[PDB]
Amino acid sequence: VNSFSGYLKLTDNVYIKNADIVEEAKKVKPTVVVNAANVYLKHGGGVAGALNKATNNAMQVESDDYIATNGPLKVGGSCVLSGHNLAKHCLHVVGPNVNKGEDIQLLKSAYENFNQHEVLLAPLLSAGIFGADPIHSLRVCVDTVRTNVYLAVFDKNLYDKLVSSFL
Numbered sequence: 396v397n398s399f400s401g402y403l404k405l406t407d408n409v410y411i412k413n414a415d416i417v418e419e420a421k422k423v424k425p426t427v428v429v430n431a432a433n434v435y436l437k438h439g440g441g442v443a444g445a446l447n448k449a450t451n452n453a454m455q456v457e458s459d460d461y462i463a464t465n466g467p468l469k470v471g472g473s474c475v476l477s478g479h480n481l482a483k484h485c486l487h488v489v490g491p492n493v494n495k496g497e498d499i500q501l502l503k504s505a506y507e508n509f510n511q512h513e514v515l516l517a518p519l520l521s522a523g524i525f526g527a528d529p530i531h532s533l534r535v536c537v538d539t540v541r542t543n544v545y546l547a548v549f550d551k552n553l554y555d556k557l558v559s560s561f562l
């Protein structure tokens with residue numbers, strides 16, 4: 396038993412809720428919150444800009460030091476950094492950005508990073524401003540992640556759509 400509430404169960408291990416991941420994170424304090432990161436960890440908008448804003452820019456400061464030391468992430472890759480006031484840890488995962496022409500097949504590789512963590516609060520990777528179809532993202536998620544994932548979907552309309560179309 397864990398502290399996530401109001402989730403609909405899609406599979407043995409995947410759950411989903413219409414929620415703001417920032418507010419979901421500040422209430423739950425999960426062990427891991429996933430950020431929808433880019434390879435530069437520049438948290439300007441979308442989920443990343445919202446998570447970063449909620450940390451009062453501390454996420455960005457930490458991220459800039461990470462990049463200065465290690466260089467950019469790979470598309471499909473990830474790093475574990477602090478969760479600041481939102482979670483114990485933040486798993487920054489780089490899904491492909493369709494609006495940059497990145498290969499959607501890398502979406503499976505991106506979701507594989509979730510398997511290194513027993514429980515995660517996460518957004519749908521490559522959705523929103525990353526330009527992929529969220530219904531496809533949820534499918535890859537279900538078919539790739541084996542650990543327990545709690546998906547927060549900010550938009551009530553898309554959420555209804557993801558549930559109603561789920562196979």
Ligand SMILES: Cc1noc(C[C@H]2CCCN(c3ncnc4[nH]c5cc(F)ccc5c34)C2)n1
Nearest residue numbers: 416431441442445518520521522523524525549
């Ligand atoms: C790059 C990239 N690749 O995929 C994705 C998926 C995103 C897209 C935009 C919606 N995102 C969220 N998801 C859950 N909660 C949220 N609160 C938010 C608050 C905001 F001000 C903006 C966004 C979210 C949000 C998911 N972005």
